[PDB]
Amino acid sequence: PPSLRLPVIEAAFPRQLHPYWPKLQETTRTWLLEKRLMPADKVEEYADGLCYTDLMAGYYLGAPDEVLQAIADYSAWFFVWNDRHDRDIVHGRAGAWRRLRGLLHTALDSPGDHLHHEDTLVAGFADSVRRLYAFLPATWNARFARHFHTVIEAYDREFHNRTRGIVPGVEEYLELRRLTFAHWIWTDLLEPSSGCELPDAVRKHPAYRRAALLSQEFAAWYNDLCSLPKEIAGDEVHNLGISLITHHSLTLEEAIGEVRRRVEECITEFLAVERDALRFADELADGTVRGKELSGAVRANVGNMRNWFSSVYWFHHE
């Protein structure tokens, strides 16, 4: 599909695949069934039909197998939560949504108290979170939590928008989508994948931070690009293209053009800033053992920021 083809990705971002990929799919399918997160037909479709675990296998290269599996299971949980959210919206279950919203905040802080919750979606959350908390120091766990609390609240904003038929302005949508897509969660997960919690001064370096953000922007905006045409009109669904059509009087074709332009700007800016981020990685190798460790971690994470582009792109195409 010409609107969806990106010659730069095909030329410049060779696909990578974590060797654990076959076991990843089997184990995630088993986990989804064990936690009763979705019925069998839906679980088989997710793991075996669309093979969603490949998205993670093409992203977090170098992760230990246990970390990758924890990420894939969390990402599978996230898919199920999004489905629940959409269903709550379509059927107006404000009460069930508010309850879930509050339960997820509570379980994020104390997963242990929620492993056997009556709501299997909450129990599955608690199990994934508990597992993700076992890899790095509590400082990383608290950052993941702070970021995820923010994601939950953004889902609540989208709930009220969509149920009341409010289409967010373009700039309002960009900001919200950074939260509902969970940009900063996938960014956080780079660190257990490379075995190192990065100090604030390192991950807040402007080359690292901008590289990290652009990687997520591409994923989110390319997703919106792929799905815009077949989106259901028109006020009760969030998509950059729809905000443009609604608030900028664009036609569908024009909006597709604007979303694609933004996507390409993301790729070309990433190519420029990635080089700065890799230079920073080298600069961290100041001769010491610790410097070598940090340098390798940043280099690995920046490599994965790049891998996300091709993982996302080829997943949509295949």
Q: Where are the domains of the chain?
A: 1-318
Nearest to 167 by CA among 238, 227, 233: 238
Q: 51 in helix, strand or coil?
A: coil
- Residues sharing a CB contact under 8 Å with residue 214, sequence separation 6 or more, in sequence order: 266, 269, 270, 273, 305
> Resolution, in Å, please?
1.9
Q: Cα–Cα distance between 234 and 46 in angstroms, integer?
A: 27
Experimental method: X-ray
CB atoms within 10 A of CB 283: 13
143 vs 16, 157, 160, 268, CA distance in Å? 28, 22, 26, 30
Lookup: tokens for 164: 């009341």
The dihedral built from the CA positions of residue 83, 64, 129 and 214, taken in this order, carries a sign that is negative
CA dihedral of residues 131, 134, 138, 142 (deg, nearest 10) = -20
Query: Rounded to whole angstroms, how far apart are CA atoms 34 and 28?
Result: 10
Where residue 273 falls (left for φ over 0; alpha for ψ -120 to 50; beta otherwise) is alpha
| Closest alpha carbon to 96 in 121, 123, 130 | 121
* Nearest Cα to Cα of residue 105 among 126, 91, 88, 90: 126
Which is nearest to 207 in space by CA: 75, 82, 302? 302
Integer Cα distance of 181 and 298 in angstroms: 23
Class of 1-318 in CATH? mainly alpha
